[PDB]
């Protein structure tokens with residue numbers, strides 16, 4: 001399923017930029033857990049990982 | 061009205077992400093107060109709550 005992964009990765013990175021739509025989830029079973037996982041992914045990427053990068057510069 | 065709440069919550073969280081549109085307000089009376097409330101919600105979520113999280117890491 002290399003092609004599916006290749007397409008989805010571009011879509012996921014675009015969603016990470018803040019632009020796009022998660023229309024691909026129609027084929028997924030148990031959509032709730034996918035929503036939760038994407039929620040936590042966004043939270044980690046934006047709140048914790050990005051903030052720590054901010055903090056490091058200030059202290060150095 | 062559990063179903064309406066379930067749908068609206070997803071829409072509201074999506075708006076919190078910065079993507080989506082607030083098309084659901086057509087059925088609402090006194091739209092102005094709804095606009096104001098969403099304004100203050102966004103202000104608190106982005107300006108004050110998010111900033112305090114930034115500040116805490118720097119001081120620790």
Ligand SMILES: CC(C)CCC[C@@H](C)[C@H]1CC[C@H]2[C@@H]3CC=C4C[C@@H](OC(=O)CCC(=O)O)CC[C@]4(C)[C@H]3CC[C@]12C
Pocket residue numbers: 006007009010013
């Ligand atoms: C966060 C940092 C540390 C990681 C760097 C991110 C890259 C690994 C991501 C960002 C955008 C991604 C790319 C988005 C689009 C494509 C084209 C894709 O091949 C295609 O041309 C089919 C899809 C298309 O044509 O758009 C193969 C993966 C690639 C290079 C993706 C692979 C991984 C990339 C470079």
Ligand SMILES: CC(C)CCC[C@@H](C)[C@H]1CC[C@H]2[C@@H]3CC=C4C[C@@H](OC(=O)CCC(=O)O)CC[C@]4(C)[C@H]3CC[C@]12C
Pocket residue numbers: 031032035036039066067069070071073
């Ligand atoms: C800011 C932090 C501390 C709170 C965490 C946010 C979650 C409580 C929000 C974010 C996205 C929300 C979800 C968006 C979509 C859905 C599916 C929804 O049920 C449906 O499948 C119908 C709507 C649809 O299929 O899209 C029930 C609520 C849920 C899990 C929402 C409930 C609450 C969630 C998980």
